[PDB]
Amino acid sequence: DLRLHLLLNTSVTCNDGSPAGYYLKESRGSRRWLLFLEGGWYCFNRENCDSRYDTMRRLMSSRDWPRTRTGTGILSSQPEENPYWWNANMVFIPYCSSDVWSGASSKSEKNEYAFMGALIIQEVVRELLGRGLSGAKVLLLAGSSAGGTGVLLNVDRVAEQLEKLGYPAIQVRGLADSGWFLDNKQYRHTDCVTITCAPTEAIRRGIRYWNGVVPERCRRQFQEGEEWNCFFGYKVYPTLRSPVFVVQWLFDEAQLTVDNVHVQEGLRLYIQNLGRELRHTLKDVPASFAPACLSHEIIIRSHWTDVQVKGTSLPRALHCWDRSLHPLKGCPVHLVDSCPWPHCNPSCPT
Ligand SMILES: *[C@@H]1O[C@H](CO)[C@@H](O)[C@H](O)[C@H]1NC(C)=O
Ligand SMILES: [NH3+]Cc1cc(-c2ccccc2)no1
């Protein structure tokens, strides 16, 4: 079990002004630290944030959080469940800012909600430095779904934070799971009039509502009013300096949802073209794992050890990545299926 700590800086808050926090399991022997960002979509105006507060309140508030959590998948401390990093220091950071971890805005007389995701990450890192992170050799910032996109938005800022604080020896790296989306043509169309709003338009509105922040080099490329581009992995990844491993199902359920897909020729060609386009964007990503499955998230699932690409599991590929950061015979790090239909890989989740 990981133990809850609410942030000592009470000005860094969840949506409703309650303190943000983190769950921690220390490993005294180890100089490896895993900081995991939870996911779960977002909200981008008063009306759809109010709805999220009624029936998804744990994603908006710490008032009802439990005192402990069990570590699962890559956050497990049992080598049988976690062949990769079972002896690491483990941190789970709950997602309570509804801003894809991009926001820097406080609740105030003009703001019903606070959107502080970017500041929550920075404050967790601080307070951890007084609990043993100051002795680390590797900090892996990982996350799933909205948390995976959050890795891409925040990994270089964590690296810059630690450099300016006087810790040049800690190696910061990223692991982005199910956060690599395409701003592609939808299978059926609707103008943005919540349910009808495409992610490009929803994120453009959200950035303005959240006071959202994107990595500096990407911001400089796309400039004012076009920062939404940096929420799409294939556009922001080439601007990053930190090593980032990309995990992405070729037919992600969240991607199909935003494409208005729920089989005849038209839809067959649409689905096959989606897999080809995703594979094309990963062509020159040297650390990646992309199976031809219809699913969503993987790295904190207990059975994450079961899926393989070309005979190599995800825990193995991540271990091969570690070795490469010290090509390797029989220990690959770029693993992308070429078969073109969901579940053409027999190891896909059921
Ligand atoms: C608390 O967090 C706020 C928001 O990031 C920051 O401006 C302030 O400096 C922090 N205070 C301390 C004492 O760390
Ligand atoms: N939790 C799923 C999720 C997906 C997204 C998302 C992020 C960027 C672009 C399109 C969708 N945000 O959250």
Swiss-Prot record:
Residues at the catalytic site: 145, 252, 296
Disulfide bridge positions per record: none
Record localization: Secreted
Transmembrane segments: none
Residue positions the entry lists as glycosylated: 9
Gene Ontology CC terms: endoplasmic reticulum lumen; extracellular region
Molecular function as annotated in GO: palmitoleyl hydrolase activity; phospholipase C activity; protein-containing complex destabilizing activity
Outcome, altering residue 145 to A: Abolishes enzyme activity. Unable to mediate serine depalmitoleoylation of WNT proteins
Enzyme Commission code(s) on record: 3.1.1.98
Induction / repression: Up-regulated in hepatocellular carcinoma (HCC) with high intracellular beta-catenin.
Keyword match DNA damage: no
Catalytic reaction equation(s): [Wnt protein]-O-(9Z)-hexadecenoyl-L-serine + H2O = [Wnt protein]-L-serine + (9Z)-hexadecenoate + H(+)
Entry comment describing in which tissues the protein is expressed: Rarely expressed in adult normal tissues.
UniProt KW keywords: Glycoprotein, Hydrolase, Phosphoprotein, Secreted, Serine esterase, Signal, Wnt signaling pathway
GO biological processes: bone development; negative regulation of canonical Wnt signaling pathway; negative regulation of Wnt signaling pathway; protein depalmitoleylation; regulation of bone mineralization; Wnt signaling pathway
Role of this protein: Carboxylesterase that acts as a key negative regulator of the Wnt signaling pathway by specifically mediating depalmitoleoylation of WNT proteins. Serine palmitoleoylation of WNT proteins is required for efficient binding to frizzled receptors.
UniProt record similarity statement: Belongs to the pectinacetylesterase family. Notum subfamily.
Protein name, per record: Palmitoleoyl-protein carboxylesterase NOTUM
Organism annotation: Homo sapiens
Gene of this entry: NOTUM
First-to-last residue of the parent protein present: 88 to 451 of 496
